[PDB]
């Protein structure tokens, strides 16, 4: 069984293309703690502790496009 369907983000994808064809600064992040793991100076880690930043940001963007906009009536998660 193979079902072909689409997500409910096409208009939001269009808006992302329209409003992010040019660069813009980001200063407010839902989960800022992924960028600042170490608080005491002179401490360093040999492990790739900053690998989760990109996934974190993308997950936040995806889940925010879905959940926050779901408050609008008839919007589908």
């Amino acid at each position: 069984m193979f079902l072909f369907f689409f997500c409910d983000l096409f208009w939001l994808r269009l808006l992302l293309c329209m409003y992010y064809c040019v660069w813009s600064r980001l200063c407010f992040i839902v989960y800022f703690n992924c960028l600042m793991l170490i608080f005491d100076f002179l401490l360093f880690c040999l492990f790739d502790l900053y690998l989760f930043v990109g996934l974190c940001l993308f997950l936040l963007l995806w889940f925010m496009l879905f959940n926050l906009y779901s408050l609008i009536l008839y919007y589908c998660i």
Partner: protein
């Protein structure tokens, strides 16, 4: 298209400030190494004295 550009844009100001400070530091170091060297040359009085001695005076 979205994330890396935004973080680069966020980086720009601090890097610009630090590089300006670095250039100022280079100029300051260039200035600080300048010293005027005052040379010393043989006093002509000794030359005059040797001339007198050569005369057998």
């Amino acid at each position: 298209d979205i994330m890396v550009p935004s973080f680069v844009y966020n980086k720009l100001p601090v890097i610009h400030f630090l590089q300006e400070k670095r250039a100022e530091q280079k100029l300051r170091r260039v200035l600080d190494e300048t010293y005027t060297e005052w040379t010393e040359e043989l006093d002509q009085a000794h030359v005059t004295d040797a001339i007198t001695r050569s005369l057998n005076i």
